[PDB]
Amino acid sequence: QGRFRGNLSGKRVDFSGRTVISPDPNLRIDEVAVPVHVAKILTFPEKVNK
């Protein structure tokens, strides 16, 4: 947990979630379902354009 291994090589970040998984065949292989509760928390900054 030092500076090199615990704070430089690998460090914790925000805008992340951890949840239990469950199978769903009705979704594409490149798609993934996200719960509404986590979706209301994780935000993406978009810039206003034309």
Q: Vertex 39, ends 42 and 12: CA angle to 5°? A: 30
CB of 15 to other proteins, least distance (A): 5
CB of 6 to other proteins, least distance (A): 9
Residue 3 in marked binding region: no
Q: Cβ contacts of residue 24 below 8 Å, gap of 6+?
A: 33
The rounded distance, in Å, linking the Cα atoms of 7 and 9 is 6
Residue 18 in marked binding region: yes
Residue 28 in marked binding region: no
Give the binding site for other proteins (CB under 8 A). 7, 11-48
Detail the residues annotated as belonging to a binding site.
5, 12, 18
